Amino acid sequence: GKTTGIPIHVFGTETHMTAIVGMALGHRPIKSTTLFSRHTKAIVWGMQTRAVQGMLDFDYVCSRDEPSVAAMVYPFTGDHKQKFYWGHKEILIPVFKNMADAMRKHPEVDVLINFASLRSAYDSTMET
């Protein structure tokens, strides 16, 4: 806005979503009942390391005893461990090639978060 000369009025989360509409038209000045617990363990289907870290940080500030992501399922890589953060502590989360093993190794899991594409989402959910 500064560099071009074009008048740009920029607002954040502190401004109401539909506040700019008012400004622009010159009207205003410029089954199961409980699904999750503090114990819930989940399997993430897909290589979504950013999402998993997102969860783990929420879990930490929630003062959860353990991380909510138990393991990840990604069919293109072999089985391995992924580095993560539990506060300032680095921790490892297992990644499995086959869902069968993830389920077997992690019986505590009752939730699956599926990040499969619209294509591979039917078959994977069916498999789960």
Partner: protein, 131 residues
């Protein structure tokens, strides 16, 4: 939201006495009424086929059913606060004293982006730039 009749199951539930807790509801897609032709919105099931499937119709029905419906989305915060304040007043809710949460360190990436920190480059090149 506009499209579908799922919102009406709530009216049914209130009338049947299954739903007793205060419900605040607003259905988006009120603009659709003003368009001369059928407009397919962002979501897949955001298409009104019947007259009952419109946001306007749904909002009217819910308001009549006893649901707390605001004038527009702009008044949603207001009506939620209104309901909440009445529930505190009636002792339905007792707000708990706020406890500060565990502290997580800032991600380096972010810190560097907001220019709060400075870290020197260990390397130096001058032949090729792939970035």
């Amino acid at each position: 939201e506009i499209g579908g009749t799922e919102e009406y199951k709530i009216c049914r539930g209130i009338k049947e006495g299954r739903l007793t807790k205060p419900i605040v509801c607003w259905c988006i897609g009120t603009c659709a009424t003003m368009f001369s032709s059928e407009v397919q919105f962002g979501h897949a099931g955001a298409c009104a086929n019947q007259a009952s499937e419109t946001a306007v119709a749904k909002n009217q029905a819910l308001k009549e059913a006893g649901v707390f419906v605001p004038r527009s989305f702009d008044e949603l915060g207001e009506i939620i606060q209104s309901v909440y304040e009445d529930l505190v007043a009636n002792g339905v809710i007792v707000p708990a004293q706020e406890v500060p949460p565990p502290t997580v360190p800032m991600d380096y990436s972010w810190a560097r982006e907001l220019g709060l920190i400075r870290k020197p480059a260990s390397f130096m090149t001058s032949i090729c730039d792939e970035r």
